[PDB]
Amino acid sequence: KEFRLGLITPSPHTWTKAAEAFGAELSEKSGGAHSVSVFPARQLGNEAQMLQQLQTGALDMAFMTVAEVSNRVPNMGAFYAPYLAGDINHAAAILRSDTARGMLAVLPQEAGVVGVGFGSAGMRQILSRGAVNSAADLSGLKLRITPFDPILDFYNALGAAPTPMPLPAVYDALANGQVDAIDMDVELINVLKCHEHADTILISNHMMFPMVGLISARVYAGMSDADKAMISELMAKHVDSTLDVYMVKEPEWTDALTKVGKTFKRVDQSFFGDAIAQWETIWADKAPSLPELRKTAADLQAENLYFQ
Numbered sequence: 001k002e003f004r005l006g007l008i009t010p011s012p013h014t015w016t017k018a019a020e021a022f023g024a025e026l027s028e029k030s031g032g033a034h035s036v037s038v039f040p041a042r043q044l045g046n047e048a049q050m051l052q053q054l055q056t057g058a059l060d061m062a063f064m065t066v067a068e069v070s071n072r073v074p075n076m077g078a079f080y081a082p083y084l085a086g087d088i089n090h091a092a093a094i095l096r097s098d099t100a101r102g103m104l105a106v107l108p109q110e111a112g113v114v115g116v117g118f119g120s121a122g123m124r125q126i127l128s129r130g131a132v133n134s135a136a137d138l139s140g141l142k143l144r145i146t147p148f149d150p151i152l153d154f155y156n157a158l159g160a161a162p163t164p165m166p167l168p169a170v171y172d173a174l175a176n177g178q179v180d181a182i183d184m185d186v187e188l189i190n191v192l193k194c195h196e197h198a199d200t201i202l203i204s205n206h207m208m209f210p211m212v213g214l215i216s217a218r219v220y221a222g223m224s225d226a227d228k229a230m231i232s233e234l235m236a237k238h239v240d241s242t243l244d245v246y247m248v249k250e251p252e253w254t255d256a257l258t259k260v261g262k263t264f265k266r267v268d269q270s271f272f273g274d275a276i277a278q279w280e281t282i283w284a285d286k287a288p289s290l291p292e293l294r295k296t297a298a299d300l301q302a303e304n305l306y307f308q
């Protein structure tokens with residue numbers, strides 16, 4: 001079978017490379033019986049559209065933001081608790097935990113997809129066209145976000161003016177003043193060159209940004225038993241590989257952003273004042289897995305079970 005695999009990420013992005021690597025290995029491991037055609041850069045639609053077509057089976061596979069999935073399955077919102085992870089290495093350990101993996105079990109019924117495992121992109125950061133010396137400076141700023149509720153809620157609690165916008169429009173929106181600031185990770189700040197019209201780069205690491213490898217449940221049900229196992233295991237391997245890329249490259253891409261002639265500062269949880277508390281109140285009755293995920297995160301840190 002010729003499977004199609006969609007992503008919203010541009011071609012240089014880690015996810016896109018991982019999807020191509022997965023496709024190559026599936027072709028080889030299947031002895032040519034199967035192939036994967038990868039469609040990056042939103043070629044097949046936006047992420048919401050792609051999830052709709054995974055649900056029907058019109059689209060076979062995706063490497064998808066857990067952000068979009070959370071629009072369908074609000075418990076996925078638990079991963080976005082601010083400062084749940086202290087850094088990318090902590091985040092990877094959380095996403096590999098039994099607690100996280102258990103949350104995948106609901107996807108076939110609730111979203112019509114099989115989630116094989118979690119990967120990630122980098123941590124979230126903030127880039128602004130003006131000076132930012134405290135959280136008050138974010139008040140009223142038109143601030144680009146990924147279109148999902150956890151991040152909307154964080155910025156609403158801070159009093160910014162969050163504005164959902166897909167990746168391709170962001171550089172132009174900054175250049176032309178349609179937004180004053182953006183929420184984005186260091187990989188894409190580098191790749192999309194969004195620092196060019198920014199004043200200040202804030203390395204806040206305020207939220208993680210998981211990825212999930214998805215197979216349409218309708219398509220999965222049509223696979224042989226051997227292929228269900230082989231394809232899901234192979235996809236899980238490639239999705240998991242992204243965690244190791246970010247564990248290595250996050251600080252490298254971050255250091256690159258000290259070389260673009262802008263004001264560069266690192267901030268921690270205290271910078272955000274009461275927004276973190278407000279976020280917890282909003283999400284307490286929306287994401288029941290949150291207390292267990294917090295316990296898992298805390299135990300991983302206490303037992304030093306990742307590189308730190």
Ligand SMILES: O=C(O)c1cccc(O)c1
Binds near residue numbers: 185
């Ligand atoms: O900021 C985003 O919307 C985004 C979406 C996908 C991957 C990624 O690194 C970032």
